Amino acid sequence: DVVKGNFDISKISGDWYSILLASDIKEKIEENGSMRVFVKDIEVLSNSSLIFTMHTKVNGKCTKISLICNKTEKDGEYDVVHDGYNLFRIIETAYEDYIIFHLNNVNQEQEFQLMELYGRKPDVSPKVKEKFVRYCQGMEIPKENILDLTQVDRCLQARQ
Ligand SMILES: CC(C)[C@H]1CC[C@H](C)CC1=O
Q: Which residues line ligand 1 at a C-beta cut-off of 6 Å?
């Protein structure tokens, strides 16, 4: 049930797992990188904001953070503060299976894009992962810059 636009936001509510991570700056998503953050859940805060809870590593320990995301003037776009100012939007989702997010980090050193694949479960179809890899390459993210997190510690032991 792939939705490609006009997403119902309340249907992306609830728990998510981070599965694949991609960026045109690999350091951002590798171990210790500012964007190596594992989603826990998404909830509707208001008619125009979301709240994400996510895990980061702090001195080796999985640590929960909360992020407030607001609709911008552009349709489908949200902003969020983390390692600077970010703009993100949904690329596509099957609400009960997976969601793909695109993010832009707007900083003065070098702007970069992030691509994220979440699943309702700690894994999804190889069909879904293939769809994501294709999007990444269409966005000129090299395959070396796509990381599979199902192999690594994604704080699953700490989600509570
Ligand atoms: C801070 C990062 C990791 C979060 C913010 C919200 C996005 C939908 C997913 C994402 O890139």
A: 35, 37, 52, 67, 80, 82, 88, 101, 103, 114, 116
Q: Give the structural domain span for 50.
A: 1-160
Instruction: State how many domains the chain has.
Output: 1
Ligand 1 centroid, distance to 79 Cα (angstroms): 9
DSSP string, 38-82: EEEEEEEEETTEEEEEEEEEETTEEEEEEEEEEE-SSTTEEEEES
The amino acid present at 30, given as its one-letter code, is E
Question: What length does the chain have?
Answer: 160
Residue 146 to residues 20, 101, 135, Cα–Cα distance (Å) = 7, 14, 11
11 Rama sector, left if φ>0, alpha if ψ -120 to 50, beta otherwise: alpha
Q: Resolution in A, one decimal?
A: 1.8
The two structure tokens encoding residue 138: 């269409």
Helix, strand, coil tally for the chain in percent (to 5): 20, 45, 35
